[PDB]
Short mmCIF file of C-alpha atoms in Angstrom, two decimals:
data_model
loop_
_atom_site.label_atom_id
_atom_site.label_comp_id
_atom_site.label_asym_id
_atom_site.label_seq_id
_atom_site.Cartn_x
_atom_site.Cartn_y
_atom_site.Cartn_z
CA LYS A 1 -102.44 -90.02 106.10
CA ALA A 2 -101.03 -88.83 102.59
CA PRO A 3 -98.50 -86.55 103.78
CA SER A 4 -99.00 -83.21 105.44
CA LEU A 5 -99.36 -79.50 103.42
CA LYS A 6 -95.94 -78.86 104.70
CA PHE A 7 -94.38 -81.05 102.56
CA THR A 8 -96.57 -81.31 99.56
CA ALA A 9 -97.43 -77.40 98.77
CA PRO A 10 -96.81 -75.67 95.66
CA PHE A 11 -94.54 -72.78 95.23
CA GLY A 12 -92.51 -73.83 98.57
CA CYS A 13 -95.13 -72.63 101.41
CA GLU A 14 -94.50 -73.06 104.95
CA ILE A 15 -97.53 -74.33 106.78
CA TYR A 16 -97.82 -73.25 110.45
CA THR A 17 -100.18 -74.12 113.06
CA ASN A 18 -101.36 -71.59 115.95
CA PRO A 19 -102.73 -69.36 113.44
CA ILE A 20 -103.31 -71.60 110.43
CA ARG A 21 -101.19 -69.83 107.89
CA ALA A 22 -98.94 -70.42 105.01
CA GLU A 23 -95.27 -68.52 104.70
CA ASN A 24 -93.17 -67.25 101.99
CA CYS A 25 -95.36 -68.51 99.03
CA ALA A 26 -93.16 -67.08 96.17
CA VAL A 27 -96.03 -66.29 93.94
CA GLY A 28 -97.61 -63.13 92.69
CA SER A 29 -96.47 -59.57 92.92
CA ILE A 30 -97.08 -56.87 95.41
CA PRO A 31 -98.24 -53.41 93.77
CA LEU A 32 -97.16 -50.30 96.07
CA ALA A 33 -98.39 -46.55 96.34
CA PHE A 34 -96.32 -43.87 97.65
CA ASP A 35 -97.50 -40.65 98.73
CA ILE A 36 -94.60 -38.52 99.38
CA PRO A 37 -94.85 -35.00 100.81
CA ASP A 38 -92.88 -32.37 98.88
CA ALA A 39 -90.56 -31.65 101.93
CA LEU A 40 -88.52 -34.88 101.18
CA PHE A 41 -87.17 -33.69 97.87
CA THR A 42 -83.78 -32.05 98.38
CA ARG A 43 -82.87 -29.52 95.83
CA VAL A 44 -79.92 -30.34 93.27
CA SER A 45 -76.96 -28.30 94.62
CA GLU A 46 -77.36 -29.73 98.11
CA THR A 47 -76.16 -33.13 96.91
CA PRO A 48 -72.84 -34.07 94.82
CA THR A 49 -72.95 -33.96 91.01
CA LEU B 1 -62.97 -10.19 82.89
CA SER B 2 -61.06 -12.26 80.50
CA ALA B 3 -62.74 -15.67 79.41
CA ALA B 4 -65.58 -16.23 81.55
CA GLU B 5 -67.87 -19.24 81.17
CA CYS B 6 -71.42 -19.54 82.90
CA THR B 7 -73.16 -22.71 83.51
CA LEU B 8 -76.49 -23.47 85.06
CA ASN B 9 -76.52 -25.65 88.14
CA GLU B 10 -79.94 -25.38 89.42
CA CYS B 11 -82.89 -24.46 87.01
CA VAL B 12 -86.32 -24.41 88.05
CA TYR B 13 -89.01 -21.71 86.83
CA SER B 14 -90.36 -21.24 90.14
CA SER B 15 -91.89 -18.07 91.39
CA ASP B 16 -89.06 -17.09 93.62
CA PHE B 17 -85.32 -17.09 92.90
CA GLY B 18 -85.06 -20.78 91.88
CA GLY B 19 -81.89 -20.85 89.60
CA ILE B 20 -78.27 -21.34 90.24
CA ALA B 21 -75.76 -20.08 87.74
CA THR B 22 -72.15 -20.40 88.61
CA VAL B 23 -69.66 -18.33 86.17
CA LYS B 24 -66.31 -19.26 86.14
CA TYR B 25 -64.04 -16.19 85.47
CA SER B 26 -60.39 -14.88 85.21
CA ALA B 27 -60.07 -11.49 86.34
CA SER B 28 -57.37 -9.12 85.84
CA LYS B 29 -58.13 -7.12 89.23
CA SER B 30 -60.05 -8.34 92.32
CA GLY B 31 -63.03 -5.98 93.11
CA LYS B 32 -66.46 -5.80 93.17
CA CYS B 33 -68.69 -4.94 90.33
CA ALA B 34 -72.22 -4.94 89.28
CA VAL B 35 -74.01 -8.04 87.40
CA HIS B 36 -77.33 -7.25 85.01
CA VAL B 37 -79.49 -8.97 82.65
CA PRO B 38 -80.40 -6.66 79.73
CA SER B 39 -83.39 -8.85 78.82
CA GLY B 40 -86.77 -9.85 80.88
CA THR B 41 -85.34 -13.21 80.41
CA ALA B 42 -83.97 -13.54 84.03
CA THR B 43 -84.20 -11.62 87.29
CA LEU B 44 -80.99 -11.79 89.12
CA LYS B 45 -81.09 -11.63 93.11
CA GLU B 46 -78.30 -9.31 93.92
CA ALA B 47 -77.05 -6.57 92.39
CA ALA B 48 -73.15 -7.04 92.70
CA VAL B 49 -70.69 -9.75 93.36
#
């Protein structure tokens, strides 16, 4: 029994059991898309300047 | 008036009255009178302030 994947995983993952899953593997990057409606854009003079 | 200065707070060339100009003046008498733009550059909302 060469040690578990809990202790040997690259990027510092955190292997768990009941769903087989890894946690918090610091690798890659998430892109994001924001479809923002036009109602949220407050005008200039309703904010300090 | 005497020594009046005009700055543009909001400026958006929208179809409605979408621009705010705050005229910083210094008046000899305190009384209402009429503002106007001679050109077709801007169309003012109110006739007097």
